[PDB]
Design a protein around this motif. Structure first.
Motif, mmCIF file in Angstrom:
data_model
loop_
_atom_site.group_PDB
_atom_site.id
_atom_site.type_symbol
_atom_site.label_atom_id
_atom_site.label_comp_id
_atom_site.label_asym_id
_atom_site.label_seq_id
_atom_site.Cartn_x
_atom_site.Cartn_y
_atom_site.Cartn_z
ATOM 1 N N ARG B 107 0.784 -1.243 0.000
ATOM 2 C CA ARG B 107 0.000 0.000 0.000
ATOM 3 C C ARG B 107 0.817 1.297 0.000
ATOM 4 O O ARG B 107 0.327 2.321 -0.496
ATOM 5 C CB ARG B 107 -0.998 0.037 1.150
ATOM 6 C CG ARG B 107 -2.013 -1.075 1.081
ATOM 7 C CD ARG B 107 -3.340 -0.752 1.707
ATOM 8 N NE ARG B 107 -3.343 -0.023 2.967
ATOM 9 C CZ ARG B 107 -3.203 -0.588 4.166
ATOM 10 N NH1 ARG B 107 -2.978 -1.889 4.280
ATOM 11 N NH2 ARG B 107 -3.256 0.142 5.260
ATOM 12 N N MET B 108 2.050 1.255 0.509
ATOM 13 C CA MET B 108 2.895 2.473 0.511
ATOM 14 C C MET B 108 3.660 2.697 -0.805
ATOM 15 O O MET B 108 4.381 3.694 -0.938
ATOM 16 C CB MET B 108 3.911 2.420 1.672
ATOM 17 C CG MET B 108 3.285 2.367 3.053
ATOM 18 S SD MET B 108 2.617 3.975 3.532
ATOM 19 C CE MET B 108 2.309 3.601 5.292
ATOM 20 N N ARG B 109 3.530 1.769 -1.757
ATOM 21 C CA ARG B 109 4.296 1.819 -3.000
ATOM 22 C C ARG B 109 3.703 2.719 -4.082
ATOM 23 O O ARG B 109 2.458 2.893 -4.169
ATOM 24 C CB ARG B 109 4.550 0.410 -3.561
ATOM 25 C CG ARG B 109 5.145 -0.579 -2.555
ATOM 26 C CD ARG B 109 6.666 -0.356 -2.273
ATOM 27 N NE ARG B 109 7.062 0.875 -1.548
ATOM 28 C CZ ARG B 109 7.090 1.022 -0.220
ATOM 29 N NH1 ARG B 109 6.673 0.040 0.576
ATOM 30 N NH2 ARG B 109 7.523 2.172 0.331
ATOM 31 N N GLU B 113 7.065 1.634 -8.547
ATOM 32 C CA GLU B 113 7.517 0.538 -7.681
ATOM 33 C C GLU B 113 6.643 -0.702 -7.903
ATOM 34 O O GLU B 113 7.162 -1.806 -8.063
ATOM 35 C CB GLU B 113 7.474 0.987 -6.236
ATOM 36 C CG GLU B 113 8.691 1.820 -5.819
ATOM 37 C CD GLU B 113 8.514 2.399 -4.442
ATOM 38 O OE1 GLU B 113 7.375 2.520 -3.960
ATOM 39 O OE2 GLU B 113 9.529 2.731 -3.814
ATOM 40 N N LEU B 114 5.327 -0.507 -7.948
ATOM 41 C CA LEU B 114 4.406 -1.627 -8.236
ATOM 42 C C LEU B 114 4.655 -2.251 -9.614
ATOM 43 O O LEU B 114 4.633 -3.473 -9.756
ATOM 44 C CB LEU B 114 2.952 -1.187 -8.114
ATOM 45 C CG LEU B 114 2.457 -0.810 -6.728
ATOM 46 C CD1 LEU B 114 1.082 -0.100 -6.848
ATOM 47 C CD2 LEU B 114 2.380 -2.048 -5.841
ATOM 48 N N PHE B 117 7.615 -4.578 -9.261
ATOM 49 C CA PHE B 117 7.191 -5.807 -8.610
ATOM 50 C C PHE B 117 6.457 -6.754 -9.587
ATOM 51 O O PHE B 117 6.787 -7.961 -9.669
ATOM 52 C CB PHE B 117 6.340 -5.518 -7.360
ATOM 53 C CG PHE B 117 5.785 -6.782 -6.723
ATOM 54 C CD1 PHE B 117 6.644 -7.746 -6.224
ATOM 55 C CD2 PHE B 117 4.404 -7.026 -6.716
ATOM 56 C CE1 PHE B 117 6.132 -8.959 -5.673
ATOM 57 C CE2 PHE B 117 3.883 -8.222 -6.188
ATOM 58 C CZ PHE B 117 4.751 -9.178 -5.659
ATOM 59 N N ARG B 120 8.928 -8.114 -12.103
ATOM 60 C CA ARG B 120 9.727 -9.188 -11.451
ATOM 61 C C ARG B 120 9.012 -10.553 -11.560
ATOM 62 O O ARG B 120 9.588 -11.553 -12.027
ATOM 63 C CB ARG B 120 9.992 -8.853 -9.967
ATOM 64 C CG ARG B 120 10.789 -9.922 -9.189
ATOM 65 C CD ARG B 120 10.608 -9.802 -7.655
ATOM 66 N NE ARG B 120 11.787 -10.355 -6.986
ATOM 67 C CZ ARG B 120 11.990 -11.649 -6.770
ATOM 68 N NH1 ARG B 120 11.064 -12.543 -7.094
ATOM 69 N NH2 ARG B 120 13.118 -12.051 -6.193
#
Ligand SMILES: [Co+2]
Ligand SMILES: [Co+2]
Ligand SMILES: [Co+2]
Ligand SMILES: [Co+2]
Lengths: 329, 329
Positions: B107-109, B113-114, B117, B120
């Motif tokens: 939730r802080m991303r 950044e998401l 992820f 990845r």
């Protein structure tokens, strides 16, 4: 002699705990996060190396044991704890319980079911590791949610069955400790098994001495946290507050001056990785406090000695209090 | 021939996917939950054996592939998927993305950044396994939260970079698909890369044909869900609804009758363990639908044939549509 506490490297004599930091973290994260996205921390290897350096520095300053109060939902990684404990030669006590970020699979559980989960982690082991928790961590942020009421009741029941202590996250300014105390006592838990944490986030000594008079341990556990000099950083301001470390430390002296030396536990709430908040919060924290978990022994203890607190009293707070608290009772 | 999809057992030719259920789960849980509390499901071994029996039964009914749309926060366990896939001889496509229970570390991303992820999990692999996701799962429950807006944007960016499709959870009655479509299109994602899921939870064909006309896949993916006969069970009522499976199935025919046969994806949203809801919900579900993931081929497909839907059309929906959807594009 004879009494034992469980650590991530197995059982140790209570008398070998020595200087103990009772509210700390290797990494503040979320369940499964380190496993799924280790690159968030550079790498798992980078995280472990950083934690080993930090714990060696705390060790050199006289810290022998930390209690890592990371629960399941803080993404506690008990293999990581064991690796860094072994490499730094610092004991680490692991935690069960739940903080304030439980997923639905926990939030849908009853008090009975939560009790069984906490008992598993204490009595059987965490995951498939055989590493047993030596403490139960719980949390409120203001008035307890209905779920949080269950968690606190399950914590009390698990404590009563095992003798393992309970430690809490509070919103100190909202005086959460009073309701937490009421719930724990409703389950017949002794206040001597309970630490009301983040209590140095407030200067309300009426609240703090109220708890100490009832036999609760008062966790003054955010010693290095201050956004003084950083007031332009909104996230750091919100999390660190605007009180100095000396102001926090003064609360240790205040409680001792009021007869409550045996009711104090002191810590940093430090960590070496931090994914549950804003990105690069770890860089901000490392600039504010490069001493990490050595800050208490290097800065706080000498401050108190210079304010006239006798060494026997300081030994009582940092050694005898954690020993009594952690010793299953 | 030539096009490939990633499964939990590695790459397979698109043409070998065959009859494919595009919204399913081995286990509906939470990140780290199966690892920390496997006894919740009896044992991990009991869970896997149950999943293998269920998937063998689906296989015998003609199911060749399921898409397990469990994200990180649904507690996706890619080793479990691989084990059961191998034992049942049914392909399983794993998912990245986030559902509606992300922890604070997600939730802080930021959108950037998401995106990293999700990339990845698609391009490198999930955790340390090398198993790559073949789909991105996202969720809203009514109007998107600010965080959910980021997740949907990150899903679009990851899709655009990899050709992997996006599939969604909706609150169908609130017509979430319209806002989800607007966000995806704002990122330049093609509607043919998107399935708007749980769309059989509503009979609003104005909403559904609106989406299909724009080129979205419409996921009619809760076929066996009904609390008819169970109206006294409040939790089952809330989750299953009061519409019959035949009413749900009629939507497949309704879309085909309106020219949209190529825009339909059909599934069950079934599972073999379920910890993210009330305890023993799995027992209720197993009583309602002992056929599990064979329900579609055994009940829905014959219902449609008897209503006059030609076999070539039924083959198009269950084979050609998932192939086109999953084929990275
Ligand atoms: Co806390
Ligand atoms: Co903490
Ligand atoms: Co859903
Ligand atoms: Co689902």
């Amino acid at each position: 002699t004879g009494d034992l506490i469980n650590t991530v490297r197995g059982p140790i004599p209570v008398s070998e705990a020595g200087f103990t930091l009772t509210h700390e973290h290797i990494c503040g994260s979320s369940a499964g996060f380190l496993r799924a996205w280790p690159e968030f921390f550079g790498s798992r290897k980078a995280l472990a190396e950083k934690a080993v350096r930090g714990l060696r520095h705390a060790r050199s300053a006289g810290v022998q044991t930390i209690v890592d109060v990371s629960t399941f939902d803080i993404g506690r990684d008990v293999r990581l704890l064991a690796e860094v404990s072994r490499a730094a030669d610092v004991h680490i006590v692991a935690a069960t319980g739940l903080w304030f970020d439980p997923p639905l699979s926990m939030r849908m559980r009853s008090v009975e079911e939560l009790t069984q989960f906490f008992l598993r982690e204490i009595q059987h082991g965490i995951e498939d590791t055989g590493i047993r928790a030596g403490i139960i961590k719980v949390a409120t942020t203001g008035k307890a949610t209905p779920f949080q009421e269950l968690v606190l009741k399950a914590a009390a029941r698990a404590s009563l069955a095992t003798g393992v202590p309970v430690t809490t996250h509070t919103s100190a300014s909202q005086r959460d400790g009073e309701q937490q105390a009421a719930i724990f006592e409703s389950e017949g838990l002794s206040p001597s098994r309970v630490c009301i944490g983040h209590s140095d986030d407030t200067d309300d000594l009426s609240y703090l001495t109220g708890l100490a008079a009832r036999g609760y341990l008062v966790g003054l556990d955010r010693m290095p946290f201050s956004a003084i000099g950083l007031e332009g950083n909104a996230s750091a301001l919100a999390l660190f507050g605007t009180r100095s470390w000396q102001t926090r430390a003064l609360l240790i002296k205040a409680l001792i001056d009021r007869g409550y030396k045996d009711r104090i536990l002191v810590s940093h709430d430090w960590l070496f990785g931090f994914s549950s908040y804003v990105t690069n919060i770890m860089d901000v924290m490392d600039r504010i406090n490069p001493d990490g978990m050595a800050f208490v022994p290097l800065r706080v203890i000498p401050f108190l000695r210079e304010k006239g607190v006798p060494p026997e009293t300081l030994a009582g707070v940092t050694v005898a209090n954690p020993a009594r608290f952690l010793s299953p009772t």
